[model samples]
Every structure is written in C-alpha cells, then in structure tokens.
Target: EIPLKYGATNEGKRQDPAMQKFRDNRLGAFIHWGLYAIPGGEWNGKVYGGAAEWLKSWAKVPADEWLKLMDQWNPTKFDAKKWAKMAKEMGTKYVKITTKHHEGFCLWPSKYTKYTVANTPYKRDILGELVKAYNDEGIDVHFYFSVMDWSNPDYRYDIKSKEDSIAFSRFLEFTDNQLKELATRYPTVKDFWFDGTWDASVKKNGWWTAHAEKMLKELVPGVAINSRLRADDKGKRHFDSNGRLMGDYESGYERRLPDPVKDLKVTQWDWEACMTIPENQWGYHKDWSLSYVKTPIEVIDRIVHAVSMGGNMVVNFGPQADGDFRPEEKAMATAIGKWMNRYGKAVYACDYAGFEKQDWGYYTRGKNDEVYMVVFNQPYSERLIVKTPKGITVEKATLLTTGEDITVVETTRNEYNVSVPKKNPGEPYVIQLKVRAA
Candidate 1:
C-alpha cells in the first residue's frame, strides 16, 4: 500500500461539451473482446466455466502456449460498420472497447511491443477500425486498458528485489509508451476505463498512477477515467478512508444493481454500473449453459434501476470470435431499442427523483419539472397512491406511452392518489405528471 498524493490539476475540469454530450447520452454499450474470445472458456478440452477473460489465469496456461492461440485469431466475419450500426439501432450513445486485457493481448497495433495485432495473423487493427466506425456513426468511443500485463517480464506480484525493481521501472515505461501511443493514434476517443490495476506493483507505485492520470488528461482533453486505474496506501482500488472516490465515476458494479431502499446514498461524483446477461462473464464464452441468463425485460428493469439512483447503466456485450453477436445478445439489444424508441424521454437526461418509494415502482424527473412515475408492479386496486412533497400540486397525469388522460385526486398538500389504467401495458408501465410548484 502506498500513500496517494492527489495533486490538483485544473487542466480538464471545465464544462466540457463532450462531457455534457456524454451525460445526455445516458445509455451506452460495453464491448469486451480480445484473445480470450478465442478460447471462449476452454482449457485442453476442459472448460473452466469461469469468465472467459480470466481463462488464461484460471487455467494457468503458459504465456508462450497462450500466444500460440493467436494462430486462430482471424475474425473473418468482423465488420466494424455493422457493429456501429447495431449500436445505433440499440439507441446506444457511446461504446467502450477493450484495447488490452490482463492476458496482455493488444487489439491495436502498438509500437511499444511485439505482443500486439501487428504480430498476429489477424493483422488488421481491431481497435482502430472500431473507433473510426463508431465515430462515423456518431457514437462516442471509449478505451479499456488493463495494467496487469502477463506478457511483460517486469511485472512482479509480491516478491521484491533490486533486479525486479529495475525491470518493473522499465515495465512502467513500456506501459506509458503504449498509453501515449493510443492517445496519439486515436485522438477522438472519449474516455479510458482502466482495469486490472489492482496488482502489487501498481499499488506500490501510486505516484506512477497519478502521473498517468495527469498525462492522459493533458493528451486527451475532456476524456473521463475510472477509479480502478489508481490505488491508495491501503491498496484500495477506488476510494480512500475519507470515502471519496478517485475517478470521474465509481465502476465495477457488474451484474449488480443498487437497491433503492438500501444503496440510495449518493456520492459527490458520477458513477456507472455495468451488467452482463450472465453473472461474471464479460467476454464471449461458449458455454452459457452453466449460468441462467437474464431476459430482456429483466435487463431493462436493471437499466431503470440504475437511472433511478442517478447512475449510468452500461450493458455488456460479449461478441463472438467472428465479431458478430449471439442470438440472445442481439435479441436483448433489440428489446432495449424498442423500449427506448418510445419511453426514451423518461430515461435519457433525467434526474433522480426526490420522492420516496411507493408500491408502484421507481420515480424519475424531467428537465421541465415534470415527474415520471415508473410502475413496475400493477396494483389490483383502481387507484395508485403517490405522496408528493410539500409546495407541489399535481395538475394533470397521463400515460407516457398512450397519452391517455389520468385522474389525480389531492388528499393533502403533500399527498395525492392518482388513478391507474384499467389494463396493464407490460413489464414497466410509466405515467407522466404535469405538476406546478405551490
């Protein structure tokens, strides 16, 4: 554990137009693709049944042996334009791609090392193509780079020595070179979501982490970063003892959603909660039979759950080795796209509701001071009770999907009982309220 000294840098801390755009585009897609996609969770004809991304470490495959799998790295059906188009169809505002992972395979052609796409038979640049294609589709592109490089000889776990220290310094230099190259190569990238930085070497070298943070902001103005990229004296990944988060947003809430009653406490900074169809599988694994995958309605409910708590929801996509989505993934995307097509106004650019939970569902607020009542469960009774705060009156209410008028009866200055539709629409029924401040 190393003491973290946060030097205040006002370089990129202004009202950035890109940041505003990012905030407005609340829904984004996360892509986790790399050498791990090749194995798809198998080791010598035995599937480890864990996340495909961790296959190399879990299976204890030798570095040289893992590199041999590159011979089968050719993604013959990979089409960048198709991927970007799918994102657009899914109403995704941005896309996050994994440029490098813990396995040390580089998707881009990096000049810093030979363990990259330039050395593989699939020599075409995957990251570069995706960035260009996504940018063309008006989708913001973000990069995911892992710091725990297994291919690097200088990476030390716990054992320390003078020779190891010198080699580790070189490893830092190599890492910096790759990062600088990435920034220079793709200047339009939006953010860098760093992962795999929890190793001992990074924890001991908090200064290097701080330096990298400074350098990245200087190179890519208005680009966002995650707290997983840094560490403090206690080897804590995101926050310090004071409970202050270290990045623009708190991450790593994969497949987990905050409970409205329990985890409603807000932090000062913004955060994103990423979710996968199956638990703990970020990369494409051949055997999804081991876990129960989430349905489209369940995924949308989780998305709403995140938005209700003032956080962004990033749905994970583990594309096949051929660069196309599986049937389940595509169906989920289409379902989300269908819902966003109609009720997106209730989702995109909405603020957290100040009201308490009700038997109905969650609550969201619009910019025009309108309140959206998201009904998760339809009550058998004809009336839906909503207790508004003081100094506010519900003038009118209507179904968001069908524009049908709804009745609102004021019970008190701070409470009201609104009428519900006779027939239920679907999983999540939303009602919009036009209120006037008393």
Candidate 2:
C-alpha cells in the first residue's frame, strides 16, 4: 500500500449508530433551490438545456451579474412549516437542502459572507427555518454545500501561479469558517454532501480536504460526510491511493445507479445514489417540455433499484422560484408516498439479498430471516423464478400488501417457482419470503 498522510480515515463499512441510522433511513428527497431558480435556466431570452443550477456558468454571466439575481430572490410562497409537511407527506425520511449552491448565495444569513440571504429581499434565515420545521416533523436534514464559490474573488479553479496559491489559501480558510458556522449554528445536521470539489484547486489541496473532514466530524459528532469531499496526497477523490473509501459513505453514484447483478461489489461499502427527476435539471427549469420528465413508476423503479443494491436513493425536487413545487413534482411525491404507505417494509431497513438476479424484479433482505421480492414486471408465465445460495431454501412466499399466500414450488435443487399474486395489483408489488438459511 502507498504510504499517505491524507487518505481514507476508516478502512471498511462503518457500523456505528450514526452510520446505521444513515443507512436505515433509506428514502430521501433533495431540495435544489438557489438564485438559478429565478431565471429557470433562461438568460438573455435564450434557454440553455443543461443543468439549471449551473445557469450562471452556462449563460456566461459574470459573478457580479449573477449575484444580482439575489435582488429578485423573493420566494413569496415559501413557508417552512408547509415545506416540512410536504416532505412528511412524501414519506421521505430525510431532506437534503441546498444551503449554498455554486452561485454562493447562502440560504442562511452567514456572517462570514456578505453575499447571503442577508442581502436578499426575502432574507429571513431560510435554512434555519427549514431545518427547524423538518426536524420538528421527524425528518433529518442534510446540507448540500458547494465548495467552489462563483461569488468569491478568492476562489480559484486551479492554482497556476503564486498569486493563485495565496488567493486559494484564503478561500480554503473562508470555506472552513463557513462550514464551522453551519455546524455550530444548526447543530442538528445529519450529513454534509460536498459538491464542486472536483476542481483542480481542491484536488491539489488534499491536506485541506482532510482537515475539513476532521474539523467537521469534531464539531458535529457522528455527523456523516460524503466521499466526494476528499482528495488524497495524490489528489485522488472517493477511494484513496490504496483503494480504501475515504468518507463515512460513498456519494459517487449521482444521477446514476450501479447494476444490481453485475456490480455486486458495491455491497462491500455503504453508499447513496441521488437522481434528478428531469433529464438534467437539478434546479427549476421553466420548460420541462424541453426534456422528458420521469413518470411516477419510473421514479419508483429507481428508488427500489437503489435500495435493493445496499444503498439509499434520494430523488430530486426542483421547486419553482415562487417556492411552490410544480404540478408534476407534487404529483410525483404523492404517488411515491402512496406506494411507500403500502410496501415500505421492503425498502426501509433493508439490504441487498444475495440472490441471483431474475427478470421479474429485485430482491431485498429484511433485518430478520425474511426476504422481499419487489416485482416490477409481471412475467407471462406468472411464475417468478428464484435461485437460492448453496444452503438456503425458500420456505414460503406471501403478498406484502395483502398478506395472501403465494405458491412456492421447488423446480430444481435450491430453485423454486414463486407464483405472482392473483390480482394484478396494477403497480409494482412486493412478495415477502420466509427463507431457511443454514
């Protein structure tokens, strides 16, 4: 192994209570709101069909002009309690809020930065209010902080000279202070999901990355951090030079997911996958018709897909500039909640079952000896194929929603043909199985 000063802090999957809670709370929602929401990806009467949060960059607007968007940042429809209620209704265990996006407009009034909600028309500690409301509603809040600040003059994309080095030094210190302030001010944040650390300047400052992680862990004991925040002595992110995971959980699976059957190696470590409902817009885009939006079932398939692979899935929500969610987003949330109400047991506190992949759907193992089959496709034969490990046997199968017994007939050695429920169920359903593992 390569000897390194700033590599992975922990060697394997963390089994602490905080980490367990992070893993067990399977379903989460992402709130991507910032000044970009005001323009909604349109600038100079031209719309850029890219990631909306990066509109400032996509539109080639200078930082000064971009900061001017804050003057119009009056989310008149924003209500902290109502927002918390919406999350609670969606059945999300957690909400990851954009405390500060790449645009450098702080949702909370940060004393360290003058370019914050303190300067906005609707300045009233938006982050603080949301945190309290969400916490009150029994939902954990994670902070999405962007390390590359477009509004900061000290910020650098890369260190090309001595002058860049000096400015970058101050920028790192400023970031540390902001982080400290956030940790101290909120005191209830469960995780810190760092972004924009892929820049060369951050990659070169591997020592600072390690320092930030250590400092935050100290300030917020048991608070989880993402792998994206780190770069080793060699400027390697996520996995270190020796291939050890650096953070409490991996956050590399953004906007995508690992293959269930082929990527079984992911079962080795704790990870989380986040998805945007629209094609690429993390922030609100005025015309979703420009891109195909994922249907409710498509979203559900992804949520189950992630949970079945020993990872948590956070579905994104791009609220409008007025602070009210679009009709499609609201409908998506309600539809997902309806399904969770019926079969959340297959998702919450579940892990990837070590079963062979079948075309019907995915298999998730509950805490006990029971396994759950979340069937997304109804086979024409009506027999869901099951292949167990060397010493495991399927005892019985039953419908998760209705508790009706399902036919489980052995076809070969350690293989069975589990029958689907009589009723169509009209949507994706789960089948609970009692397994006998020696």
Candidate 3:
C-alpha cells in the first residue's frame, strides 16, 4: 500500500453505536432541492436531456443569469412537517438533504452568503426546519453540501497562477465558514454527504479536504462522512492513494451498485449507495418521459440488493419547485412504505450473510440468530435451495409474511432445500431462516 497523509482515518468498518445506528438504519431517502427546482429542467423554453440539477451547465447559462432564479424562489406549498411525515410513512430511517447544490443557492439562511433563503421571498431557514421536522418524526438528518460554487467568484475550475491560488483559498475559507455554521447550528445532524468536489481545483487541494473532514468530525463528534468528500495527498479520490477508504462509508455506488460476487471487497467495510428513481434525474426534470423510470418493485429490488451485499441504500426524491414531491415519487414512496410495513424486519438491521447467491434471490442476515431469503423469483421446483458455509447448520425456515413453517431438507453435505410458501404471494417475498454452527 502506498503511504499517504490523507488516507483512511478509521481502519475497517466502524462499530461504535453512532456508526451502528448509521448502518442499522439501512433504508434512506435523499432530498435534492435548490434554485434548480425553480426551473425544474427547462431553462429557455427547452428542457434539458440529462440531470436537471446540472441544467446550468447544460444550458450554458452565465452564473449571473442563473443566480437570478433565486429572486423567483418562493415555494408556497413548502411544508417541513408534511415532508417529514412523508419520509416517516416511506419507512426511511434517514434523509440526506441538499443543503446547497452546485448551483450555489443556499437552502439555509447563511450569514456568509447573500445568495440564500434570507435574501429570497421565501425567507425561512429551510434546512433548519427540515432538521427539526425530520428529528420530530425520529428520522435522522444528513446534510448534502457542495464545495464547487458556480455563483462565487472565488471558485476556480483549475488553479493556474498566484491569483487563482489566492482566490481559491478564499473559496476554501468560505466553505469552511459555512460548514462551521452548519455544525454549530444543527448539532443533531448524523452525517455529511459532500458533492460537486470532482473539479481539478478541489482535487488539487486534498489537504483542505482532509482538514474539512477533521473539522466537521471535531465539531460534530461521531458524525459520519462519505468517501466522496475525501481526497488524499496525491489527489486520489474516494479510496486514497494507499487503496483505503478515507471516510466513514464507501459512497462510490452512485446510481449503480457493486456486483455481489465480483465486488465482494465492499463487504469488508461500511458502504452506502444512492439511486435515482428515474434513470438519470436527481433534481426535478420537467419531462420524466425522456428516460426509463424505475417502478417500486424494481427500486425495492435494488434496496434489498444493496443490503444483501452488506451496504446501505438511499433512494433519491426530486421534489418539484412547489416544495412538494411529484405524484410518481409519492406513489413509489407509498408502495415502498406498504412493502416495508409487511417485511421491514428483513431490511432494517440486516446485513450480508456469507452465503452463495441463489437462483431465487439474495440472503440478508439479521441481528438475531436468523437469515432472510428475499426471493424475487420463486422457482417452479417448489424448493428454495441454499448452500451454507462449513459448520453452519440450517435448523428451520419460516415465511416472513405469514410466519408459517416451511419444510427444510438437507440435500448434501452443506446444502439444503427449503420449501417455498404454500400460497403464492404474487410478488417478491422473504423467508426467515434459523441457523446454528457446531
């Protein structure tokens, strides 16, 4: 392993109560809101094809022109309480909110910036209200911050000279001030999910990135950080130059996941994946028909898949400019909520079980002496096959939905055939297993 100053701070997965709570609360939700929501993908009468939050880059609008949208930012229907309730009903254990996106509009009224809610018609502390309301519903809050500010003059794409260095240093201090303000203001925040640090400017300043992580942890003791927020002495992102994860969790799984077998290394540490319901939309786009939108079942499959691989999943929601979620998002959340209502025990605190992947579905191990078979496809053989590790004995099996006993038979030395449910559930289902080792 190559030596580095900004390599992984903590070795392996964190086991403290705070880290446990971070991992145990597996299913999470992401709120992507900012001035971009005002446009909702259309800039000059033409809707962008890609990510709406990046419409500024797509439309080639000048920062001055794009900043004008903040003047029109009044979401009359915005209700923090209603938003919190929606998350609670969706069965999400936590919510990661875009406190500030790359567009440089601040959701909270930060004294350091005039381009914030304090200067808009909707003069309210949006982030504060959300943290409070989400906490009220017992939902953990994680802040999504961006360091590459398009509206700030101090921001540099790539530092070329002394002027660039001086200006970018100013930008770093501003970011540090904003982070300090956030930590001092909202002491209950459980995590910080940084974004928009992919530019060469930020990457070159890897020391500041490490300093930022240290600063935040110092301010909010036990708060978790994402690997996306870190860069090493050699400008290596996510995993450091030494091939070690630099933050609390591996956040490289953005809109994609690790292969269960090929990427087994991910299971060695804590990690989290975020997915957009629509193919490429993170923030609200005017026309979702441009891409393939994922249904609740498909989304749930991804959720279960991540947990099956010892990783957490956070589903993304792009609320409209009116500060209310779209009908499709609401419907998907409701469906997931109903599904979790019935089979949440298999998800909430479960992790990877060191078992071979079966033709039926994935296996998730619970905190107790049990494992769950989240079967997406029930085979015609009427038998759910499983291969256990050495000395791990399969005692019995029970349907998670109805809690009815299912017959278990040993087929070979370390293999077993568990019977499928007596009645067809017509959808994805889970079977809990009792296991022992001698």
Candidate 4:
C-alpha cells in the first residue's frame, strides 16, 4: 500500500447518525437545474444531443456568451413547495439539488459572485427556498456542488506554469468560500454530492480537496461528503493511494449502477448510484426524441437493484426552465410513487441480504433482519428458488403488499422452492421472507 498523508479519516463505513440517515434513506432524487436549462441543448438554431448540462462546451460557446443566458434565468413558475410535494409523493427520502453546476451560475445569491440569482430578474434564493421546502416535507436535502467553474477566468484545467499556479490558488480559495457559505446558510443540509473534480487542476491540489472535506464537516457537524471530492497526494481519486475509500460515501456510480451479483463488495461500504431518465440528459433538453427515455418500471427496477446491493439510488429529474416538470417526468413520478407506497418497506432501511442472487429477482434485508424478495422476473416453472446461506432456514414467506402467505417447500438443506401467489398481484412485487438460523 502506498503511504499517504491524506488517507481516509475513518477506516470503515461511518456509523454516525448522519451517515445512518443516509443509509436508511435508500431512495433519493437528483435535481439538475441551471442556465443550460434555458436553451435545453440547442445553440444558434442547431440542436446538440449531448448531455444538456455540457451544452456550452459542446457548442463551443465563449464564457461571455454563455453568461448572457443568465439574463433569461427566470423560472417564473418555480414553486419550492410544489417540488417538495412531488418528491414526497414520489417516496424519495432525500433530494440533491444543484447549488451551482460547472456553468458557475449560482442558484442562490452568493455575495462572493455576481454570476448568481441575485443579479438575475428572478432575484430569489433558489437554494434557500428548496432547502426549507424539502425539510418541511420531512425530506433531507443534499447539495450538488461543482468545483470546476467555466465562468471564472482564474479556473484552470491544469497547472503548467507559475502564473497558472497562482491563478489556480485563487480559484481554490473561491471554491472554499462558496462551500463555507452553503454550509453556514443551509445548516439542515445532510450531504454534499460533488462533481467536476476530475480535472488535473483539482487532482494536483489534493491537499485542498482533503481540506475542503474537513472544512465542510467543521462548518456543518455530521455533514456527509461524497467520495468524488477527495484526491490523494499522488492524484488518486475516490480511493486514496492505499486503496481506502475517502470521504463518507462513494459517488462514482453516476448514470450507471453496480453489478447486482458481482459487485457485492459495495456492501462493505456506503455508496450511492444516480441515473438520468433519458439516455444522457441531466439538464432539461428541448428534444428527448434524440434518445430513449426510461419507463417507470425500468426506473423502479434500478432503484431496487441498488438497494439490494447495500447502496442508495437517486433518480434524476431535470425540470424545465419554466419550473414545471415535463409530462413524461410527471407520469414517471406518479407511477414510481404508486410502487413505493405499496413496497417501500422493502426499500427503506434495506440493505444486502447476503443471499445468493437468483435470475428471478433481487434480495434486500430490512433493518429488522427481514429478507425481502423483490421479484421482477416470474419463472416459467411458477416456482421461485430461494437459496439461503448455510445454517439459515426459510421459516415463512408472505406477500409484502397483501400479507398473503406463500407455500414454501424445503428442497435442499438450505434451499427452498416458494410458490407464487394464485392471483397475480401484477407489476413488480415484493415477498417478505422470515428466515432463522437452524
């Protein structure tokens, strides 16, 4: 193992109340809002089909030109209470909102930067309202902060010369100030989902990354920081040079998920996986016709898949510039909400069950040691094979929604063949299993 000064502060998963809340709240929503939402992926009458958040880079728009879009940054219909209500209805325990994206347009009025809502026609604290609204709904709030600022001239992609080093130093200081401001202003925030730290400039300044993590925790006690914020002295990120995870939880699973069966190592640590509804669009896009959008069932399966692996799953929602959700998104929230209302017990406070994965479905263990079989694939044989770990016996099985008992026959020493319900409840469902050591 390579020795490092800035390795993980905690050797294993954090056991604090804040980290526990993060683990217990398995489902979350990611809100990606910014100036880019105004154009929604079109530049100069030509539509670009890349990630809508990266529109400025795709269109090669100058910083000055991109900043001009802020003039139209009026979300006239933005209602923080409405957003919180939707999230609560969707069964999301937490919401991660973008305080500032790479575009450097601050959602809140930051005294340090003129490129903020304070200068806009809206002139409202978007982040402040959002925090209060989400908290009022009994949902935790996490801030998504980008370190690489395109609007700042001092920001550097890499440090090459003495002049570049001096400018980059100033950029780091500016970033720290913004972070401190966010922490001081929104004390109720639970976590920080950091992005845009893959640049060489940030990698070289590993000390600042460590310092930033420490600084935030100091400013806001028990505030969880994502693994994306940390880089070791040798430019190794997420994990330190000694192969230990930095920060409170892993955040590398963006726009994708871990292998349900093969990636069980994630059970050893805390991690979160976030995904976009479309093929690739975190920010609002004028045309989703460019790519395939995920169905509600598809989204639900992913959410369950992550929870089954002892990790958190966050679904992305890119609200339109007018501050209203698109029809597709609204429909998805309602559908997912219905599923959660029925089977949320299988999701909330759930983790890996340590059961061998089966083709029929995934297994999740509740905080009370209750094993849940979230079935997505019904077998042609009409029998769900449940193989328990050594010395464990399946005592009883029941449908989670209706509490109807399922017939279980022990076929082997630790394996059981469970029968599906006579009447199909329909859609993806969960079966609660009572297991005991025998």
Candidate 5:
C-alpha cells in the first residue's frame, strides 16, 4: 500500500451521541439555491436541457457575465421561517443548503470574496437566516460547499506549471477561511456535504482535503464530513488506498440509489443519498417538462427504500429565484407530508432488517426491535410473504396505522404467508411484525 500522510482519522462510523442523532434522523431535505436559480438553465434566450446548476458551463456564459445576476438577486418572497416550516411538515430531520455552488457566489458575506450576498441587492446573510430558521424548527442544518470555484482567478482545474501551483495554493487558503467563517458563524451546523472535488487539482493536493476535515472537526466537535472531500496521497478519493472509508459517512449515492437485493453491502457503513425531483435538475429550471418529474409516491418509495438499507435519503427542492417553491414542488411536499404523518414511524429511527428481499416491498427495523414491512406492491394473491432467519418465530402481525391484527399462517419451515387487509390501503402502507427467536 502507498504511504499517505493524510488518510482517515476515524477508521469507522462515528459512535458519539451526535452521530447517533444523525443516523436516527433518516430523512433530509436538499436545497440547491444560488445565482443559477436566476437564469435557471437558460442563456442567450435559449433554454439548455441539463443540470440547472451547471447552466454557466452549458450556456458558455463568462464568469463576469454570470456574476451580474447579483444585481437582480432580490427575493421579495424569501421567507426563512416559511422554508423551514415546509421542511418540518415534510418530516425532514435535517436540511442541506448550498453555501456556495460551483459558480463561486457565496450565500454568506465572506470577507475573502467580493462576489457574495452582502454585495447583492439582497444584502442580507442568507445562510445565517436559514441556519437559525431551520434550527428553530428543530431541524439540523448541513452546508453544501463546492471546492471547485469557476469564478475565482486563483482556481485551477489542474496544476501544470509552477505559476498554477502558487495561485492554487492561495485559492485553498481562501476556501479554508470561508469554511472557518461558516463554522464560527453557525456553531449549530452539523454536517458538510462537499462537491466538485473530482478535479485533478484537488486530487494532487490531497493533504488539503485531510487538513480541511481536521480543521472543521477541531472548530466544531462531532460535526460530520462527507466522503467526497477525502483523498489519499496517491490521489484516490472516497475509499483510500487501503480500501477503508475516509469520512464520517459515504456520499457516493447522488441522484441514484443502491439496488435493494444486490447492493446489500451498503448496510456495512453510514451513508446518505441525495436525489432531485426531476431527472438531472438540482437547481431551478424554468422547464421541468424537459425531463420526467417524480411523483410523491415515487419519492416516498425512495425514502423508505433508503431507510430499509440502513441509509439516509435527502429529497431535493429547487426554489425559484423569488424564493417561493414551484407549484409542483409544493404539491409534492404536501403529498409526502400526508403519508409521513401517517407512516413516519416506519422511517425515523429505523434501519435495515435482515430479511430476505421480497417482491411486496422493503423491510425496516425500528429502534425497539420491531420490524416494519413497508408494502408498496399489493400482490393479487392477497398474501404478503415473509421468510424469517433460522430459529426466528413470528409472534404477531398488526397494521402500523391501526392496531388491527393480521392473520399469519405458517406455510413451510421458516416461511409464512401474512394475510393482507380485505380492502386496499389506497396508498403505500406499513405492517408491523412482532417476532421472537426460538
């Protein structure tokens, strides 16, 4: 194995009370808000069909031209409390906000950068208001920071010359200062979700990644860092040269989920998955018709699917430039809230149940040793199949919403056919099972 000066500090998932809280809070909300929301995937009067956040690259808009959006950055409808309330009602335990995207526009007024909210027409600390409001709503706040800054002159995609190395060093220091400012300003911030670090420049200077993680932990004890920020001396990211996870939790699952049956290995570590409502739309786009938009049920299925695999899932919401959520997003939030209000017990504080994968739905284990079957598929057989591990016996089965009993008939050894309700649930529902070891 190649020797590395900066590798994983913690060999495994953090086991402190704060880390436990993060794990228990199995659902999160991801907000992608920035200057990109202003143009919203359109440039030169032509709309580009790609990730809205990458519109600058798509439209080939110069950095100075892109920065002009700050002049029109007043969000009259931007209400921090309203945004927090939506997330609270959506049953999210945490919210991840972009402090700065690849565009290099800082949401907070950073002394190191002229391009910030302080210089904009909306000359208020947007990040501060969000942190306070989300915390007030009993939700943890996580900051999303991009290491690759397109607007910074010192930023380098790859260091090919001595001049490039010197300029890039200054950029690293500038980033460190911004991160320090965030940590000191919002002491209650819990996690850091880093992006755009896959460039060769960042990979070559792997020591800075480890130092950043160490510095943040020193500033805010128990604060979690995502795996995307780490790299070994050999420029290997995520998993190190020795094949061990480097950060507090894995952040590899973005806009996609692990297979329920085949990818069971994800259960071995703490990880979080973030997804967009519409395909490839992390930031606001004027036209969602360009791609397929996910329904509330589809979103709910993904949420439960993540919990069943012992991972957290964050559903993305791209609020408009005016700070009001689009009608589709608002409706999606409301619909998800309705289901969570009824069946959230199957989500929060739940983890993977060591059950055989079934066609009916996924299985999640509650903190109290109760197993939940979140049934999405209602078989025409009117029977839900259950296969327990050897020596485990099913004691009773009951509806999670109501305490109504479900008849459990033992078919073959270690297998049972659990009867479904005579009437359809009309939506995805949960069945609670009490089991015992023989």
Candidate 6:
C-alpha cells in the first residue's frame, strides 16, 4: 500500500477542456472481456453463479490453470462496427473496454509480456479495433485496466521483508510499463477505469496508483482516472492520507446504486454506477435462467436512479464467446434505446433533480432552466403529485413524446397535481416543466 502522503495534490478542480468533454459524457457502457469469458462463469464443471471477473477466487482456480484459458480467447466473429453501432443506438456518449482484467489477459498486444492477444490465434488487437470503431461512431473510448495480475509470479500479498518491497517495486515498474504502452498505443483513449488494486500489497504501495494516475494524465493530457485505482494506508476506498481524491471521479458503484436521500454527499464529487443485467454476473453467463435477469425496464429504472442522484450509470454488456450479444442482451439494448430515443430528454445532458422525491418518478434538469419529471411507474388514480419549492411557479406541463398539454391544478402555493392522460404511457414518460427562477 502506498503511504497516504502521495494523495496530496494542490491541483484545483478540473477545468481543462478535455476533462470538461469527459464530464459531459455522463453516460457510458462498460465492456468486460478477457479469458474469463471463455468459461463464462463455469469452473471445473460447476457453474458458479457470480461475476466471471472474480472467477479466480470464486472457484479457486490456480494461476497457471487460469492462464491456460487464454488460448481459447479467439473472437473470430467480433465485429467492432456492430458493437459501436449498438453503443451509438443505446445513446451512450462513451464506451469503456477492458484492456486487461485481474487475469492479466491483455486485449491489446503488449510488448512487456507474452500474455496478450499476440500470443493467441486472435492476433488482432481488440482494444485497437474498439478504439477505431467507437471513435468513428463519435463515442469516446476509455480503457479499463487491472493492476492485480494473479498470473504474475511477482505479485505479493504483503511487504513483510525488504525483499518483498524490492519485488513490489519491480511489480510497479511492470504496471508502469504496461500503462505506458497503453497510453502511447491508444493516444485517443479518454479515461482509465482501474480495478484489482484492493489488496494489502496494493494499499501499502498505493502511492504508485496515484503516481500512475499522474503519469497517465501527463501522457494523455485530458484522460480521466477512476478512484478504485487508488489505495490509502487505512484501506480507505478513495482519498489519500491528506484527504484528497487521487482521481477524476469516485467509482466502485458496481451492481448497485446509491440511495437518493442518503447518498447525496457524493454529489459534491463526480461519480458513476456500473450495473449488470443479472444480480451478480458481470461477464456473459450462458444460463441466465439460473439467476433472475433484469428486463429493459428494470435496467432503465436503475439508469434513471443514477441520473436522479447526479451520477452517470454504466450498463454492462457481456458479449458471448462467439463474439455476438445474446438475444436477451440485444433486446435490452433495443428496448432501452427505444425509451432513450423519446424520453432521453430526461436523461441525456441533464443534471440531478433538485426537488423532493415524488410518487410519479425521478426528476432531471436542463441548462435552459427547465425541470423534467420522468414518470416510470404510474399510480392508480391517473394523477401525479408534484410539490415545487417556494417562489418557483410551474408555467406549463407538456408531455415530451407528443407535446400534448397536461392539466396542472395548483392546489397550493407550492403543491400541484398534474393530470395523466386516459391512456397510460406504457413506457417511461417525461413531463417538461418550464420554471422561472425565483
């Protein structure tokens, strides 16, 4: 673990134009691909119902055995254009691809190690293809790198002796070399979402995490880094010893979201929530029937939940071994794309809802001084209650889909009940409220 002292930085809040571009890309997609995808959650003839990314510990697969699966990593049918098109249709402004996971299988051909795509029959660079395709689709590309390499013999759990620190120093250099290769090879990459840095060894050497962050930013001028890439002496999730966030945003919101009222403190800093279709499975699990899968509506609800709390939601997609998305995953993308097509006004480029929670739905704001009330679940009475703050009066209520007028009855100075249409909008609907600043 790096001492907490390295977390100190006098740098002010990010005002760089590149970082601004990054923040503007509030929505993105996380692609988890590696040797784990070959097994897709099954290990030693028993299918473990968990994220494939954690298969190492879940099934206790030995390092050598795990690395042997790399030979099976051949995405012969992988189509970058098709994946990029799906991301564009899903309305994501950026796409984050796993360059390397804890398994240490590099998607790109890394000169530092033989454990890369070059070693497999699929010699083509996966990350390179995605960079071109996603960039071509006008979506920013972010690299997801894992610092913990279970396959590497040099990895240590703790620095008990001087020799351990020396070996750890070599490990840090190895990571630096890989990061340098990534930064140089894909100069257009916009962000780095790091994982597998939570071990005691990493925490003691966490100063290297911060150092890697600074090194990446200096190399790639506007590139952003996630907080998971850092570790303090106290095992704090984020922030170094001196009480400063070492990265651009607070991450680690995987498979869950923050409470609207309770997690408001995180709103002060930029953050994101990454969610999987299944309860715990992140990588492609062959049999979703074993676990309850999330419908498109449920996925959209979580996305709205994150946006409501002023955080970006990254929905995960685990492509199959054949390099094609499962029907369920594709259907989810299409369904969410349909909803985002119409009511995305309530999601895209919007700020957190400032008003209290209502029975109707989540709230979002626009730069034009308008508040959008997105109703995902309609009540039985065909009536929606909205209580605005003092002094701001609702000018008019209109449906985003049809531009039809919605009846607004001001029961009190700040309380109003907006009438719903006789036919309920089956999907998520948004009511645009034109408000004047008090």
Cα lDDT tens digits for candidate 4, 348-429: 9999999999988899999888999999999888899999899888889999888899999988878899998878767989
**Once superposed on the true structure, which residue ranges of model 3 sit more than 4 Å away at CA?**
none
Off by over 4 Å in 1: 1-4, 7-15
For all predictions, the C-alpha RMSD in Å is 2.4, 0.8, 1.0, 0.8, 0.8, 2.3
Compose the digit string of candidate 1's lDDT tens values, residues 71-134.
Answer: 7888888999999989998888899888988888899999877778778777999999999999
Error of 6 at 386 (Å): 1.2
- Once model 4 is optimally superposed onto the true structure by TM-score, how far is the C-alpha of residue 310 displaced, in angstroms? 0.4
Per-candidate TM-scores read 0.94, 0.99, 0.98, 0.99, 0.99, 0.95
Per-residue CA lDDT of model 6 for 1-438, tens digit only, reads 355455745344475887767766667888988888888888879988767778888999888888888778788889999999999998888888989888888999999888888888788898899999999999999898888888677888888999988888888899899999999999999889998887889887766777888899899988888888886556565776566776888786788788877778766667778888888777778778877889888888888888777778888888887688989888988888888888887887777757878867788887587789888889887878888877778889998888899898988778888888656887778889887767
Residue 183, candidate 5: Cα error in Å is 0.5
Worst 10 residues of 6 by lDDT: 4-13
Q: Tens digit of lDDT per residue, candidate 5, span 1-438?
A: 667787767766778998999999999999999999998889888999999999999988899999999998998899999999999998889999999999999999999999999998889999999999999999999999999998899999999999999999999999999999999999999999899999999999999999999999999989999999998888989988888888899998888899998999998889999999998999999999999999999999999999999999999999899989999999988898889999999999999999999999999999888999999999999999999988888999999888899999999999999999767899999999999987
Alpha-carbon local distance difference test for all models: 0.82, 0.92, 0.92, 0.93, 0.93, 0.83
Badly placed stretches (over 4 Å) of model 5 are none
Model 1 residue-pair collision total: 1
Candidate 6 residues lying further than 4 Å off, grouped into runs, are 1-4, 8-13, 233-235, 241-244
Worst 10 residues of 5 by lDDT: 1-10
Residue pairs in candidate 2 whose N, alpha carbon or C atoms collide under 3 angstroms = none
Clashing pairs in 1: 2-233
Predicted structure 2, TM vs. truth: 0.99
Error of model 2, residue 210, in angstroms: 0.7
User: Worst ten-residue run, lDDT, model 3?
Assistant: 1-10
